[PDB]
């Protein structure tokens, strides 16, 4: 007869703006997860936290990606070389590679990526799939609406029979980076001087709201403003993960003020208790019209993004989209995000349609769904005919990826 | 025209699927007949083992990777009753 | 009823007086098919217990009243 | 003296038994406790497998059938010399169909 | 011999794709050594594994003839790939 | 005056038995069963009547 799956020695890479997820196919979690941002000195590149977090003179901090697509190919190549050398620790010519890509990735970047992987790394086989499809596959769904709220974008992607419906995509920029900017504005309003850990030699405990008592390292080299801002944002991201909480209903200041506070201590020893402002900040994801200094009321909340994306699809598949809403991305891990989204969508979905959000609320499942789907797909024995081979590339060139990887 | 433009003007030779009027449909899974198609491969049922460990409550049989046959299990509020039933 | 597994005496040293070693309970663990349970019986059972000549791995029968 | 009974009722109003064995050494001969092997080794015949039957012979290892016994007694004449060829490497066709391959029948 | 139960006297059943609830108990996996190794030392010791090998294979219904690698028993080298039978094309 | 000692012993024994009950309740935690035998897995019968 037949057997179940089949393991072929493949590798799965899912590269985002925030971190690079990589590992071997067949495993249920990525082997490694390190930041996508890297240092440059001029070029010489420094990758991963242990080399990135050390201060160094004239070292700029960059990203290879822009709008979810590759711009700096030298940085991307450096990241891949680092991943192959230090983390995978195996020769690249032996392992097939399945790569994740953005739903909106252009043809030219797909062709350039295929050319890079086949001609430089000399891999034996290649496949390229979109994030939403793998996110659906990780939850056992072929049809469903993927809501991915990452760092750069909050996007609703409808999926049907393992294919992205590109004309139904709705992008919004309100995501983790926007929340980081709002936290920066909050600290400026509160007159909270933010000192990253690298500047601190030692610290002493102090009271709530009192000035910090800390000593600065004397042996520091002069560092660029980009690296300093990246280090500050690393602190603000911990603040996001710790303190912020979505209001269960529409934000009322008098109700949020009565909630218990949350204590947070900064690396320099400054500490204070945070009240309603920790709930006012993430409310802009859902009701951006009340945000201060935001450019116009034209932009959409998360629920309205979902409904617009579903309404732009064919009427026959909308039950299948509302019956499987797969929430994904790290920014969805803010406390009570999913409950608020479910309530708002229940208030806006038609009563004739049943709404069902997939139970997915863990860090591993929310952040690494695309990688898990890639591992699942590469582990299928039915999939093994779908690889682009090196022979196919040498015969048909880089244009074969459009035919073979829709 | 009672139904307006949307009268069911049948055409010869065609076949038609009726709509769900009484209850909204649902997937083949996470969905009993009280809501949707109950494909039995997704169904959990009470099960007993020949080794003396008792009724294990609701369960399916599923083949995993490597040809290994596993028993899934599902939570019930009456698991304490299914044990010492 | 079930397979005996313990034959475990408890201990509290003294019966509130001049003493050697005092048990105050006897822990008897039974397992048959469905599960396992420990019973802290009256110490008086011990006479009847070796009168029946039970050991670990035996299977017994005890009436409640 | 082991004091077969002592009941006091003193506290709720109650009733107890406090057996006091005394003499130290009297305790363990009344409570030896136990630690038996819960199950045995499940024995399999070296020749054609299936569960073992009867027991071992007067020497060596158990068997399932008279044919297995005959092969085992034709075996061990190759080993009483305490030197020679492999006494049991596929000796005398000891049930050789390999759904999963078999070692030699020399477990003793 | 072995019993499963779908009673009329209680009348309930549940369905799920991945799992019913986060409180679901984990699955039950097969095992041979649950009763200890000494229980089954002779059964395992009277047998020898068939060898496996990391080995090339062809025809998943590919047109290029590219050979990928996998784990299979060494006696099963020249066999055609089973999953090629799924390669059905719409007419 | 031994009734004071008996009272103290009874309180101590009650505390000890409550501690044992809590210990048993903790011992009832985690997965009670993670594995089932080969014969059950590959019986293929699993029938209802």
SS3 for chain A, per residue? CCCCCCCCCCEEEEECCCEEEEEECCCCCCCEEEECCEEEECCEEECCHHHHCCCCCCCEEECCEECCEECCHHHHHHHHHHHHHHHHCCCHHHCCEEEEECCCCCHHHHHHHHHHHHHHCCCCEEEEEEHHHHHHHHCCCCCEEEEEECCCCEEEEEEECCEECHHHCEEECCCHHHHHHHHHHHHHHCCCCCCCHHHEEEEECCCCCCCCEEEECCCCCCCCHHHHHHHHHHHHHHHHHHHCECCCCCCCHHHHHCCCCEEEECCCCCEEEECCHHHHCHHHHCCHHHCCCCCCCCCCCHHHHHHHHHHCCCCCCHHHHHCCEEEECHHHHCECHHHHHHHHHHHHCCCCCCCCECCCCCHHHHHCHHHHHHHHHHHCCHHHHCCEEHHHHHHHHHHHHHHHCC
Other C-beta atoms closer than 10 Å to the C-beta of A404 total: 17
Cα atoms in the Cβ-side hemisphere of radius 13 Å centred on A13: 24
Record the tokens describing residue B38, joined without a space. Answer: 């109950």
- Rounded CA-CA distance A79/A97 in Å is 15
- CB-based contact E2:B50 (threshold 8 Å): yes
Give the up-direction half-sphere exposure of residue A312: CA atoms within 13 A in the CB hemisphere. 17
Chain F, 10-29: which have a CB under 8 Å from a chain D CB? Answer: 10
d(CA D101, CA E45): 11
CB proximity list for A146: less than 8 A, separation 6 or greater: A131, A132, A135, A136, A155, A156, A157, A158, A159, A326, A328
Tokens of A170: 């709705």
Contact B63 A5 (CB under 8 A): no
Instruction: Find the radius of gyration of the CA atoms of chain A.
Output: 23
Tokens at residue A144, please?
Answer: 């469903």
* CA A77 – CA A109 distance, rounded (Å): 14
> Residue A18: left (phi > 0), alpha (psi -120 to 50), or beta?
alpha
**Residue B27, φ and ψ in degrees, nearest 5:** -70, 175
- Report CA dihedral (A271, A274, A280, A282) to the nearest 10 degrees: 60
* Mutation site, C3, C31, C35, C59, interface B, largest B CB count within 10 A: C35
Return residues 34-53 of E near F (CB < 8 Å).
34
- Closest-CA distance, B65 to chain A, in angstroms, reads 6
Q: Which residue of F has its CA nearest to C35?
A: F32
Of F31, F35, F48, the CB nearest to E4: F48
The answer to whether C28 and D33 are in contact (CB under 8 A) is: no
CB-CB: which of B53, B61, B70 is closest to F33? Answer: B53
Q: Which of A232, B1, A273, C42 is nearest to D4 (CA)?
A: C42
Q: What are the structure tokens assigned to A350, written together?
A: 């038609």
Q: Are B25 and F10 a contacting pair, CB within 8 Å? A: no
How many helices (H) and strands (E) would you count in chain C? 1, 5
Residues of F in contact with C16 (CB under 8 A): 2, 5-6, 9
Distances (CA, A) of A323 to A41, A364, B52: 50, 23, 42
Resolution in A: 2.4
Using a threshold of 3 CB pairs under 8 A, tell whether chains A and C touch: no
Cα(B47)–Cα(A184) distance, rounded to whole angstroms?
Answer: 57
CA separation for the pair A244, A176 (Å, rounded): 12
Tokens read off for E12:
């309930």
Question: Looking at chain B from residue 17 to 76, which residues have their Cβ under 8 Å from any Cβ of chain A?
Answer: 24-27, 30, 63-67
- Chain E residues with CB under 8 Å of F38 CB are 30-32
Q: Yes or no: say if D22 and D13 are a contact pair by the CB < 8 Å rule.
A: no
A356: left (phi over 0), alpha (psi -120 to 50) or beta: beta
F35·E2 Cβ contact <8 A:
no
Structure tokens at A99: 């790569």
Q: Is D17 near chain F, with CB under 8 Å? A: no
Q: Give pairs for E74-77: CB < 8 Å, separation 24+.
A: E74/E50, E75/E50, E77/E53
Output Rg (C-alpha) for chain C, integer angstroms.
Answer: 13
Is F46 in contact with B71 (Cβ distance < 8 A)? no
Contacts of B63 in chain A (CB under 8 A): 4
Q: CA A312, CA A240: separation in Å to the nearest integer?
A: 33
Q: How far apart are CA A89 and CA A92, in angstroms?
A: 9
Please indicate whether chains D and A are in contact, defined as at least 3 beta carbon pairs under 8 Å.
no
Q: How far is CA A255 from CA A291, A339, B21, in A?
A: 19, 18, 43
Chain A CB within 8 Å of residue E84 CB: yes
Interface of A to B at Cβ within 8 Å reads 3-5, 319, 323-324, 352-354, 356, 379
What was the structure determination method?
cryo-EM
B45, B51, B68 member nearest F40 (Cβ): B51
Token digits of residue B60: 């399916």
């Amino acid at each position: 007869g037949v057997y179940g799956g089949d393991e072929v020695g493949a590798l799965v890479f899912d590269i985002g703006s925030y971190t690079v997820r990589a590992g071997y196919a067949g495993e249920d979690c990525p082997k490694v997860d390190f930041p996508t941002a890297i240092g440059m000195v001029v070029p010489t590149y420094y990758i991963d936290t242990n080399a990135l977090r050390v201060p160094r003179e004239n070292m700029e901090a960059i990203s290879p990606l822009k709008n979810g697509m590759v711009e700096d190919w030298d940085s991307f190549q450096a990241i891949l070389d680092h991943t192959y050398k230090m983390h995978v620790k195996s020769e690249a010519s032996l392992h097939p590679v399945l790569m994740s890509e953005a739903p909106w990735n252009t043809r030219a970047k797909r062709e350039k990526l295929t050319e890079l992987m086949f001609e430089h790394y000399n891999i034996p086989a290649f496949f390229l799939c979109k994030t939403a499809v793998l996110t659906a596959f990780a939850n056992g769904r072929s049809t469903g609406l993927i809501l991915d709220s990452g760092a750069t974008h909050t996007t609703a992607i409808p999926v049907h029979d393992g294919y992205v419906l590109q004309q139904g995509i709705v992008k919004s920029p309100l995501a983790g980076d926007f929340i980081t900017m709002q936290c920066r504005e909050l600290f400026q309003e509160m007159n909270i001087e933010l000192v990253p850990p690298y500047m601190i030699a030692s610290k002493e405990a102090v009271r709530e709201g009192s000035p910090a008592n800390w000593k600065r390292k004397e042996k520091l080299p002069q560092v660029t403003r980009s690296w300093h801002n990246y280090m500050c944002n690393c602190v603000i991201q911990d603040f996001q993960a710790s303190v912020l909480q979505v209001s269960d209903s529409t934000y009322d200041e008098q109700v949020a003020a009565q909630m218990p506070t949350v204590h947070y201590e900064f690396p320099n020893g400054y500490n204070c208790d945070f009240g309603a402002e920790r709930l006012k900040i993430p409310e802009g994801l859902f009701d951006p019209s009340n945000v201060k200094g935001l450019s116009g009321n034209t932009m959409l909340g998360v629920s309205h993004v979902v409904t617009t994306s579903v309404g732009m699809c064919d009427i026959d598949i909308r039950p299948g989209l509302y019956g499987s809403v797969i929430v994904a991305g790290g920014n969805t891990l803010i406390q009570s995000f999913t409950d608020r989204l479910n309530r708002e969508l229940s208030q806006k979905t038609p009563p004739s349609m049943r709404l069902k959000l997939i139970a997915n609320n863990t860090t591993v499942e929310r952040r690494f769904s695309s990688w898990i789907g890639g591992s699942i797909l590469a582990s299928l024995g039915t999939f093994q005919q779908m690889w682009i081979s090196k022979q196919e590339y040498e015969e048909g060139g880089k244009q074969c990826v459009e035919r073979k990887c829709p | 025209d009672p139904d307006g433009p949307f009268a069911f003007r049948r055409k010869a030779g065609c076949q038609y699927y009726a709509p769900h009027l009484d209850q909204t449909g649902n997937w083949p899974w996470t969905s009993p007949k009280d809501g949707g198609l109950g494909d039995v491969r997704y169904r959990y049922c009470l099960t007993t083992l020949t080794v003396p460990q008792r009724c294990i409550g609701f369960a399916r049989r599923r083949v995993g990777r490597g040809g290994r046959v596993l028993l899934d299990r599902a939570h019930s509020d009456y698991d304490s009753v299914f044990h010492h039933l | 009823e079930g397979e005996v597994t313990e034959l475990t005496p408890c201990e509290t040293e003294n019966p509130m007086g001049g003493y050697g070693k005092t048990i105050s309970h006897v822990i008897i663990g039974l397992k048959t098919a469905k599960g396992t349970k420990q019973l802290k019986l009256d110490p008086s059972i011990f006479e009847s217990l070796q009168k029946e000549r039970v050991e670990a791995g035996d299977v017994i029968y005890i009436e409640a009243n | 003296p082991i004091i077969t009974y002592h009941s006091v009722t003193v506290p709720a109003r109650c009733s107890r038994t406090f057996i006091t064995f005394s003499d130290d050494a009297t305790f363990e001969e009344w409570f030896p406790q136990g630690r038996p092997p819960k199950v045995p080794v499940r024995e399999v015949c070296p020749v054609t497998h299936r569960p073992a039957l009867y027991r071992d012979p007067v020497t060596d290892i158990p068997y399932a059938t008279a044919r297995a016994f005959k092969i085992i007694r034709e075996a061990y004449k190759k080993y009483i010399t305490a030197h020679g060829l492999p006494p049991t490497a596929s000796a005398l066709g000891p049930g050789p169909p390999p759904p999963e391959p078999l070692p030699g029948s020399g477990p003793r | 011999t072995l019993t499963f139960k779908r009673p009329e006297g209680m009348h309930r059943e549940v369905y799920a794709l991945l799992y019913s609830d986060k409180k679901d108990a984990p699955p039950l996996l097969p095992s041979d050594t649950g009763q200890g190794y000494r229980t089954v030392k002779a059964k395992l010791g009277s047998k020898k594994v068939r060898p496996w090998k990391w080995m090339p294979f062809t025809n998943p219904a590919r047109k290029d003839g590219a050979m990928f690698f996998h784990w299979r028993r060494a006696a099963e080298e020249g066999k055609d790939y089973p999953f090629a039978r799924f390669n059905k094309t719409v007419q | 005056a031994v009734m004071t000692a008996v009272r103290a012993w009874e309180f101590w024994n009650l505390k000890t038995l409550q501690e044992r009950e809590a210990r048993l309740r903790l011992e009832q935690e985690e997965a009670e069963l993670l594995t089932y035998t080969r014969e059950d897995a590959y019986s293929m019968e699993y029938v209802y009547e």
